[PDB]
Amino acid sequence: SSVDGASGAGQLVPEVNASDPLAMDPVAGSSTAVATAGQVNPIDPWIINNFVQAPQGEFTISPNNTPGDVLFDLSLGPHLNPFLLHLSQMYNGWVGNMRVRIMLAGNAFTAGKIIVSCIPPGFGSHNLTIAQATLFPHVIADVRTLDPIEVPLEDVRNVLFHNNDRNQQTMRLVCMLYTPLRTGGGTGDSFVVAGRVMTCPSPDFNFLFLVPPTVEQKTRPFTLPNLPLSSLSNSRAPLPISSMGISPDNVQSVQFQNGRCTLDGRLVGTTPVSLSHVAKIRGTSNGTVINLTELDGTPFHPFEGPAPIGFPDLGGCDWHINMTQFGHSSQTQYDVDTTPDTFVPHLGSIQANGIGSGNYVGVLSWISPPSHPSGSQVDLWKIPNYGSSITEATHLAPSVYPPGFGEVLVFFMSKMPGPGAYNLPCLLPQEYISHLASEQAPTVGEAALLHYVDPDTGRNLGEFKAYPDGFLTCVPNGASSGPQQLPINGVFVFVSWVSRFYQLKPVGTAS
Amino acid sequence: DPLAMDPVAGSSTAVATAGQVNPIDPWIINNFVQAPQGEFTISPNNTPGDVLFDLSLGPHLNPFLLHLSQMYNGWVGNMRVRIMLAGNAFTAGKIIVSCIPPGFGSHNLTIAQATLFPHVIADVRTLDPIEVPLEDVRNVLFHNNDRNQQTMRLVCMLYTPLRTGGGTGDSFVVAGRVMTCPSPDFNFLFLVPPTVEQKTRPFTLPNLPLSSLSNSRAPLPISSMGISPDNVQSVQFQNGRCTLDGRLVGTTPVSLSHVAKIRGTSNGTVINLTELDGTPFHPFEGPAPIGFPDLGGCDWHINMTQFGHSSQTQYDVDTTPDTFVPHLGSIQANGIGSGNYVGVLSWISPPSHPSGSQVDLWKIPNYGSSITEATHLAPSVYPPGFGEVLVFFMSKMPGPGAYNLPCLLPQEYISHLASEQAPTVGEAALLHYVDPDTGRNLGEFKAYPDGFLTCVPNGASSGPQQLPINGVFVFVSWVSRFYQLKPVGTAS
Amino acid sequence: QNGRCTLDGRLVGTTPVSLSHVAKIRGTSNGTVINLTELDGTPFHPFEGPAPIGFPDLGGCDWHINMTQFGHSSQTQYDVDTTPDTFVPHLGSIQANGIGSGNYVGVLSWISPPSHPSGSQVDLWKIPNYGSS
Amino acid sequence: SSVDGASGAGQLVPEVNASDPLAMDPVAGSSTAVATAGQVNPIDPWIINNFVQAPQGEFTISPNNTPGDVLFDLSLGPHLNPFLLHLSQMYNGWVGNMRVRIMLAGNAFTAGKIIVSCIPPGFGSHNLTIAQATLFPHVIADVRTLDPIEVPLEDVRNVLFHNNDRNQQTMRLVCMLYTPLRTGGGTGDSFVVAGRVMTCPSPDFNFLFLVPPTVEQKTRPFTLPNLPLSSLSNSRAPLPISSMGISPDNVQSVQFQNGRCTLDGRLVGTTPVSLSHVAKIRGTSNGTVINLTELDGTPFHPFEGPAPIGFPDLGGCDWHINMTQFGHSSQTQYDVDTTPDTFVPHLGSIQANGIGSGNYVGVLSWISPPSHPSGSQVDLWKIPNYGSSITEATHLAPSVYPPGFGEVLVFFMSKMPGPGAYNLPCLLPQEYISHLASEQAPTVGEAALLHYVDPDTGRNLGEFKAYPDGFLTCVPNGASSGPQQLPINGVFVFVSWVSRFYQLKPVGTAS
């Protein structure tokens, strides 16, 4: 299976890693649980020795990385091996050790070292300095080493075995950059070292109790709906996606309230589940002020959020919705300016520039440049002013920004009907949101590496990173280049969980 | 580390129930031969996950075996595969080969997923050839020549990006070569009269230069290769339509002798069509008489003749009138005496009825919209593939201007395909447009089963138009879904 | 002269490969004499053969083609007698019994009994006279 | 003798070539002929083991080469070894095997592989694809391999032995590029791999019958006259050489009719043997039209060629020759325009713009810019219009063009007397032609590698390629540079036979 280039690698790089043994005693496997577990479930012997790419199987070192940066943080569990992960969904509990193999093999021109340290359960989370890492049983390796480093992840236990809950704390394997990475030679800065992590269970490892296959959440794999982008819709308005886009050089952080969902499936802001609630409002007109309620007719509440669920979040826009009513044959237009002191969505009170009394259901369908400021340009990156009710907790959705090395926020855009060429940007397609909500799959790792692919040929079109808070990022090639240059036939495919600093390959074509 | 597979038996299983067990020439037995799809290159531009090659266990991988398969009706055995890479000690990057069992599917994978199969990951710097056993995982005792037989597959993908050091010449790429050879387990099964079985017949294209051939829509010499304008995407001709199996579609005939011709009885008002043999046409058998011209946006007109009567009469036709019901064998006789003639399209003009506007030969004329009958038209063809474009064979036709007539397949090709009804194995046929004299490859094309070619144009102006018409199309091998063509044309 | 081919696969006489070159001629009409060329617009040569490749070989026949031209919407019947001394196919020079000047492409489509012998019967077994050079 | 840099080559390149044996049985040597040959002639034991550079001893790989390109094509015979070749001229027949050694050793930075395949006699000539080559017993090697690859060229025979005729078909060794050549590092594109081929006979090899030493043509070595360029003359006119030159960027193909000879010694066009026939005409003046004949007085014939042997071939020129006559004290001038319909050299008929009746002998000696076109410039690269007699086979000499990688045609030029600075270009010097004709030496290989050298110091001044059809080519350094910058004291020396694609080193100095 493994064929290191030893034969033709000359002798520019070290084959095997010479290192002192782990300052740690061996730990027992199943022998412990045998007497108290209800069952001791054996696993397929074929899995027992195959070193397979872990779900957290990739990482990257680059000269941008600084010593101390965490390349990957592995916590002992079935979730470290794809096969085990699948079997996890069927059992309740486990005990055993894992065999980890990190792979490196940079050019004979690269220099640098990493450090892997085992952290005992019960230590807790603390930001470790490279020097601190030394205090734990560790191993150090040169990035050029041909043969993969093998490190045993011992199952240090206080109890007989483990269950599939959050009350469990297992041992960790933290890998950080030890010394800065620096390529010599004709330095192609596009050069970063691509690492791989593979694992296989030690024969001590065993699953414990047979249980209904899917029920537990801890075992659920992160999945994305297999649907071409074009077929999906926007989250800030009921419009179909047209293309992907990037925020102008000026715009950096964003605070959209609709179309926000955590990768675990947690809805944030005013984000609803279905499009049937997107960019709409319901309330009773007083001929002067409209008293808002949820679309269900249920009463809105200032402690609930910034505004009623589904309440449109277009900022630098002077939007006007189409309002309809039940039992009354009519269709009117409601022009709204987000500037006036009468615009207090947070208190279920807004203006009524020309609407009779009653109760309506309006759908945003026509926007225009903001009137009140100075009769100026449209800025859809902005969010409207939700009544600053000092007497009520304005629970807003936080702002997002790209945390990676030269990464930028990626938006899904659809053209919006108005007095010009407008296109509404959102963070995630509505359907994606709907999916995540259903499958509340726990997010393992700081980010999810995705590969945008053409379903027909299976050609990798782009590389993106999805962050926990619910948003994608990418590295645009040239200033002119970016995801806008990509077709909307593709689908996003989850590749592996990665660290905050996994460096992506620039997207698009620069010329 | 080893391969996650138990070895599979060879002929052992066959002996008991096959009629014979035929041995192979020992010289072939362990001689490594390059496979048809045996070439690939890894440029720094490839990303981990890109597919380098795809293989299916079968006699077709080895030309010797292939030639032999046409003499026996079965086989079982294991091949040996060798991948060889060409790299310096100054490179880096790994490749991964996964063994995919038959009965899986052609869905695309992640490099992570590729690991889940018994696999081999090699570092680019390796000097020695990488040997991987292609095992005959079987559900049955042995294989009978079928397309139903699914075999062991080998998929190769880039595992880690190619990173070359030194004064990095981005022109630098790691080339790869694939070779196979049967192992002593392999054996052919029953001796059958050579080339009689259809299932074994190899795909073949006539060994003739494009220039000497003709169009399948009108009896005109092919003068150039062209592409449909950015505006024209889907096409749907009715003549010059033929599957690689050798099945004639639409009104497509075999010989040029039936191309762009019609025969029928003139009522002095309406012309009642029939097949060229004087046989009755039938709205159910097809959308129009076999050989009936399919030139769309054109105000074309033939030169009719008759037997036993010394005469030549120009018959003008507009494809717009409600009297134009080709599907019912009834058309207009705009100024024709009664009788029964034989017309041949010889002069075209821009369509009169739309507004006296321009000609569009990419279009197809209207074949009498009969609801009662089954106007079984030949389906529209569009280019299937990421950036693949439809290739056409054009000939200049006489009229008031420049009339380059598009075509899908030279008639001669059609005549050939029908004769040798070769089964289509795989998704597309990789072809090479070679210059006969130099034996040099001028372009890489794809032939799809339905009967048409495709290619990847280099620049917006660059493409097949920039190629000489002295080349011959040579069949290389049956390619996979993942095969990406090499851009054709001279870009600079 | 057409439809002549050895089993080795060697084309003999004016025999072409495709029907697309059968019973056809292309040349420049001098309004008196027609100066022939190969269908590609390439020059014919008395030494390479007895006549242009694809040039009809119907003998005892007073045949005549239907000529066309590119960039000109036209169809003109060109009548031919294989007896006249002006009929020198071998030298790419023939009669233009009533044809305007230009360069056309003719296809044999209608035959009649030979006029010059005595207005007698047709003999398709014969071969026409290719200018005795 | 052989000292591979193993000691200091580090371990960046492979020493020995690891390859599976040749799928082929050993073949017998002399043992066969012993009983029926009249004699079995032994050869000097010193030749038996010396690996010497074969006459087809050089080849070059460059990134311009594409897989499939033939680097060299060797056919079994004495002509593969310089010593044997010389002995060949003395014997009639042979039998035996050869030992071939191809040498490579590119930088540790180059990557690439070649393939050598043995092709059985009786297969014939076919353009093989790299994949086809695999079907024959073959060997593959990496261009970096230090130690020379040794391949036995087996004498597969249908008969007992061989004779020195063309009825013989021996085994071949075709070497093609297997994978594209690509240099890494600080890529100096001037970098191409210089290969060498050396051979020595296997002790099985033996010559057969003693025969008069030179008589047979098959054995004759290609030779060039050892004379400094300056001493030679032009082929299109009786003028001494002045300097070498290149066709202007615009001119590519040429069709000169005089000064054309195949390397085997075959005269083409109107090319005569001696200068005494160059640029001359003879015929009888009719006061209006001159009826041409050969200089011998013999009658010219339209089936013979384009014009009488020696008939001047200057195209874009309005030339006028000096005409003399026998028995009549006179010297007149004959001004000729190559445009008129009266100018039918192919039919032995030309004008007589002012010449009385009789028979003359004219020598081109004065040229002027073409009158009839538009009174425009002189283009000596052109060839005049030879009467397009449709009733006669205009057997013209084909056109020539450089087939190599960035190669251009090399011309020999002499200054011609006229109204300005004119210089007549030709393909080969007349004397060279005279030589080739005498020594009809068979041409082995697609081209002959020549080295222009200063006879006094023996310094290599330039590298050129002579093609079978009779013309040289070279790679000019800069646009300003070329062979015009070289002295005319040099002599051309045959180095080795090479493939069509042998890449030459640019000539001259660019600045």
* CATH number for A461: 2.40.510.10
B306 and B453 in a single domain? The answer is no
Residues in chain B with CB shorter than 8 Å from the CB of A105 are 92, 94, 123, 160
Query: How far is A113 from A106, CA to CA, in rounded Å?
Result: 11
Name the amino acid, one letter, at D19. Answer: S
Q: Which residues of B223-258 are buried (b: 16+ CB within 10 A; e: fewer)?
A: bbbbbbeeeeeebbbbbbbbbbbbebbbbbbbebeb
H or E element, residue D83: helix D82-88
C133 touches chain D (CB under 8 A): yes
User: Which backbone phi and psi does B13 adopt, to 5 degrees?
Assistant: -70, -40
Find out whether A182 and A111 touch, Cβ atoms under 8 Å: yes
Can you spell out the DSSP letters for A381-410?
Answer: TS-------TTS---PPPPB---STT-EEE
A455 and A491 in a single domain? The answer is yes
Residues in chain C with CB shorter than 8 Å from the CB of D391 are 46, 91, 133
Name the amino acid, one letter, at B25. Answer: D
Q: Output the 3-class SS for chain B.
A: CCCCCCCCCCCHHHHCCCCCCECCCHHHHCCCEEEEEEEEEECCCCCCCCEEEEEECCHHHCHHHHHHHCCECEEECCEEEEEEEECCCCCCCEEEEEEECCCCCCCCCCHHHHCCCCEEEEECCCCCCEEEEECCCCCCCCEECCCCCCCCEEEEEECCCCCCCCCCCCCCCEEEEEEEEECCCCEECCECCCCCCHHHCCCCCCCCCHHHCECCCCCCECCEEEECCCCCCCECCCCCCECCCCCECCCCCCCHHHCCEEEEEECCCEEEEECCCCCECCCCCCCCCCCCCCCCECCCEEEEEECCEEEEEEEECCCCCCCCEHHHCEEECCCCCCEEEEEEEEECCCCCCCCCCCCECCCCCCCCCCCCCCCCCCCCECCCCCCCEEEEEEEECCCCCCCEECCCCCHHHHHHHHHCCCCCCCCEEEEEEEECCCCEEEEEEEEECCCEEEECECCCCCCHHHCCCCCEEEEEEEECCCCCCCCECCCC
Shortest CA distance from C109: residue in chain B: B305
Q: How was this structure determined?
A: X-ray
Find out whether B147 and B125 touch, Cβ atoms under 8 Å: no
B284: left (phi over 0), alpha (psi -120 to 50) or beta: alpha
Could you say which DSSP state residue A88 is in?
H
Query: How far is B311 from B313, CA to CA, in rounded Å?
Result: 7
Query: How far is B97 from B78, CA to CA, in rounded Å?
Result: 17
| Structure-token pair, residue D406 | 């960035």
Query: How far is A119 from A176, CA to CA, in rounded Å?
Result: 13
Closest CA to A12 of A159, A202, A218, A185: A185
| Structure-token pair, residue C99 | 């044809």
| Structure-token pair, residue B210 | 């494009």
B191 and B223 in a single domain? The answer is no
| Structure-token pair, residue B178 | 């694939």
* Domain end among D351, D368, D385: D368
Q: Which subunits have 3 or more CB–CB pairs within 8 Å of chain C?
A: B, D
D23 touches chain B (CB under 8 A): yes
Closest CA to A499 of A173, A164, A112: A173
Query: How far is D462 from D480, CA to CA, in rounded Å?
Result: 16
3-class DSSP state of A478: coil
Quickly count: other Cβ atoms within 10 Å of residue D465's Cβ.
24
Taking an 8 Å cut-off on Cβ atoms, the answer to whether A451 and B125 are in contact is no
| Structure-token pair, residue B480 | 């996979």
Find out whether C67 and C24 touch, Cβ atoms under 8 Å: no
Find out whether C91 and C29 touch, Cβ atoms under 8 Å: no
The angle subtended at Cα A185 by Cα A180 and Cα A191, nearest 5°, is: 55
Query: How far is A40 from A37, CA to CA, in rounded Å?
Result: 7
3-class DSSP state of D438: helix
CA distance A183 to chain B (A): 8
Instruction: Residue D73: give its domain's CATH number.
Output: 2.60.120.20
- Distances in whole angstroms, Cα of residue A302 to Cα of each of A183, A297, A392, A393, B116: 57, 16, 6, 8, 52
User: Which backbone phi and psi does D231 adopt, to 5 degrees?
Assistant: -75, -15
Instruction: List, in order, residues 6 or more apart from B92 with CB less than 8 Å away.
Output: A105, A106, A107, B123, B124, B125, B160, B162, B163, B164, B165
Cα–chain-centroid distance for residue B119?
A: 32
Quickly count: other Cβ atoms within 10 Å of residue A128's Cβ.
18
Q: How many helices (H) and strands (E) does chain D have?
A: 4, 25
Query: How far is A212 from B489, CA to CA, in rounded Å?
Result: 60
| Structure-token pair, residue A278 | 């997107």
The angle subtended at Cα A356 by Cα A350 and Cα A360, nearest 5°, is: 65
Name the amino acid, one letter, at B43. Answer: S
Q: Rounded to a whole number, what is the largest CA-CA distance in chain A?
A: 85
User: Which backbone phi and psi does B160 adopt, to 5 degrees?
Assistant: -130, 140
Query: How far is D5 from D433, CA to CA, in rounded Å?
Result: 45
Residues in chain D with CB shorter than 8 Å from the CB of C46 are 390-391
The angle subtended at Cα A265 by Cα A261 and Cα A269, nearest 5°, is: 35
A244 and A320 in a single domain? The answer is no
Burial degree of D472 (CB within 10 A; 0-12, 13-18, 19+): buried
Residue pointed to by tokens 């070895």: B7
Find out whether D100 and D197 touch, Cβ atoms under 8 Å: yes
B139 and B275 in a single domain? The answer is no
Quickly count: other Cβ atoms within 10 Å of residue B308's Cβ.
5
B90 touches chain D (CB under 8 A): yes
H or E element, residue A464: strand A460-467
A53 touches chain B (CB under 8 A): yes
Taking an 8 Å cut-off on Cβ atoms, the answer to whether A10 and D14 are in contact is no
Instruction: List, in order, residues 6 or more apart from A223 with CB less than 8 Å away.
Output: A435, A439, A441, A494
Burial degree of A108 (CB within 10 A; 0-12, 13-18, 19+): buried
Query: How far is B372 from A507, CA to CA, in rounded Å?
Result: 55
Q: What is the resolution of this structure in A?
A: 3.4
Query: How far is A265 from A468, CA to CA, in rounded Å?
Result: 10
Q: Which residues of D252-264 are buried (b: 16+ CB within 10 A; e: fewer)?
A: eebbbbbbbbbbb
Can you spell out the DSSP letters for D207-257?
Answer: EEEE--TT--STTPPP------GGGSB-SSSS-B--EEEE--TT---B--S
Query: How far is B448 from B387, CA to CA, in rounded Å?
Result: 15
Chains A, B: CB contacts within 8 A come to 136
Find out whether A318 and A369 touch, Cβ atoms under 8 Å: yes
| Structure-token pair, residue D269 | 């066009």
Residues in chain B with CB shorter than 8 Å from the CB of D185 are 90, 166-167, 169
Hey, of A62, A83, A107, which one would you mutate to test binding to chain B, going by the most B CBs within 10 A of its CB? Answer: A107
Taking an 8 Å cut-off on Cβ atoms, the answer to whether D178 and B177 are in contact is yes
Hey, of D390, D391, D392, which one would you mutate to test binding to chain C, going by the most C CBs within 10 A of its CB? Answer: D390
Name the amino acid, one letter, at B476. Answer: V
Pick from A190, A459, A463: CB nearest B386: A459
A305 and A442 in a single domain? The answer is no
User: Which backbone phi and psi does C71 adopt, to 5 degrees?
Assistant: 75, 5
Hey, of B303, B341, B397, B470, which one would you mutate to test binding to chain C, going by the most C CBs within 10 A of its CB? Answer: B303
D215 and D225 in a single domain? The answer is no
Query: How far is A208 from A32, CA to CA, in rounded Å?
Result: 12
Can you spell out the DSSP letters for A318-379?
Answer: EEEEEEE-SSS--EEEEE--S-STT-BGGGTEE--TT--SEEEEEEEEEEE--HHHHS---B
D10 touches chain A (CB under 8 A): yes
Instruction: Residue C26: give its domain's CATH number.
Output: 2.40.30.120
CA distance B291 to chain C (A): 15
Find out whether D47 and D83 touch, Cβ atoms under 8 Å: yes
Query: How far is A323 from A366, CA to CA, in rounded Å?
Result: 12
Pick from A52, A459, A505: CB nearest B116: A52
Domain range for A335 is 278-368
Pick from D11, D185, D186: CB nearest A11: D11
- Distances in whole angstroms, Cα of residue B430 to Cα of each of B51, B202, B337, B484, D392: 17, 13, 52, 10, 47
What's the length of chain B?
492
The CA radius of gyration of chain B, in Å to the nearest whole number, is 27
Q: Which residues pair with A414 in a beta bridge?
A: A424
Query: How far is B469 from B457, CA to CA, in rounded Å?
Result: 17
Query: How far is B302 from B285, CA to CA, in rounded Å?
Result: 24
Can you spell out the DSSP letters for D393-404?
Answer: ---PPPPB---S
The CA radius of gyration of chain A, in Å to the nearest whole number, is 27
| Structure-token pair, residue D28 | 């017998």
Query: How far is B166 from B90, CA to CA, in rounded Å?
Result: 7
Helix, strand, coil share (%) of chain C residues, nearest 5? 5, 30, 65
Closest CA to A349 of A406, A281, A279, A395: A281
Shortest CA distance from C133: residue in chain D: D391
Query: How far is A489 from C42, CA to CA, in rounded Å?
Result: 50
End-to-end distance of chain A based on CA atoms, in angstroms? 41
Closest CA to A430 of A217, A223, A280, A229: A229
| Structure-token pair, residue D59 | 């080849």
Residue pointed to by tokens 């052989």: D2
Closest CA to B199 of B102, B22, B60, B103: B60
Find out whether A302 and A389 touch, Cβ atoms under 8 Å: yes
Torsion of CA D166, D169, D171, D176, to 10 degrees: 70
3-class DSSP state of D35: helix
CA distance B122 to chain D (A): 17
Residue pointed to by tokens 């489509």: C109
Query: What is the bridge-based pairing of β-strands D471-474 and D408-416?
Result: antiparallel
Residues in chain B with CB shorter than 8 Å from the CB of A188 are 163-165, 168
Query: What is the bridge-based pairing of β-strands A193-201 and B440-448?
Result: unpaired
Closest CA to D85 of D199, D186, D173: D199
D279: left (phi over 0), alpha (psi -120 to 50) or beta: left
Q: Side by side, which strands form the sheet with B174-182? A: B33-42, B174-182, B79-86, B130-134
| Structure-token pair, residue D488 | 């005319």
Query: How far is D236 from B64, CA to CA, in rounded Å?
Result: 56
Find out whether A433 and A44 touch, Cβ atoms under 8 Å: no
* Domain end among A368, A397, A425: A368
What's the length of chain D?
511
Find out whether D468 and D262 touch, Cβ atoms under 8 Å: yes
The angle subtended at Cα B472 by Cα B467 and Cα B474, nearest 5°, is: 115
Query: What is the bridge-based pairing of β-strands B174-182 and B33-42?
Result: antiparallel
D120 touches chain B (CB under 8 A): no
Instruction: List, in order, residues 6 or more apart from D250 with CB less than 8 Å away.
Output: none
Query: How far is B469 from B249, CA to CA, in rounded Å?
Result: 26
Query: How far is D253 from D408, CA to CA, in rounded Å?
Result: 10
* Domain end among A307, A334, A368: A368
Residues in chain D with CB shorter than 8 Å from the CB of B177 are 113, 178-179
B107 and B194 in a single domain? The answer is yes
Query: What is the bridge-based pairing of β-strands A2-3 and B119-123?
Result: parallel
Query: How far is A399 from A252, CA to CA, in rounded Å?
Result: 10
CA distance A2 to chain B (A): 5
D213 touches chain B (CB under 8 A): no
Find out whether C32 and C84 touch, Cβ atoms under 8 Å: no
A1 and A146 in a single domain? The answer is yes
Closest CA to D449 of D503, D508, D509, D507: D503
Whether chain C lies against chain A with 3 or more Cβ pairs closer than 8 A is no
Query: How far is A57 from A75, CA to CA, in rounded Å?
Result: 13
Asked whether the CA dihedral A296, A298, A302, A303 is positive or negative, the reply is negative
D188 touches chain A (CB under 8 A): no
D396 and D436 in a single domain? The answer is yes
Taking an 8 Å cut-off on Cβ atoms, the answer to whether D184 and B164 are in contact is yes
Helix, strand, coil share (%) of chain A residues, nearest 5? 10, 30, 60
B249 and B291 in a single domain? The answer is no
Residue pointed to by tokens 């299932």: B199
Find out whether B159 and B139 touch, Cβ atoms under 8 Å: no
A8 touches chain D (CB under 8 A): yes
Asked whether the CA dihedral D32, D35, D36, D40 is positive or negative, the reply is positive
Looking at the structure of chain A, the number of domains it has is 3
Query: How far is B360 from B106, CA to CA, in rounded Å?
Result: 39
What's the length of chain A?
511
Residue pointed to by tokens 């715009």: A251
A212 and A253 in a single domain? The answer is no
B173 touches chain D (CB under 8 A): yes
Find out whether A427 and A259 touch, Cβ atoms under 8 Å: yes
Residues in chain B with CB shorter than 8 Å from the CB of D111 are 86-88, 91, 172, 174-175
Query: How far is B459 from B463, CA to CA, in rounded Å?
Result: 7
Residues in chain A with CB shorter than 8 Å from the CB of D11 are 10-11
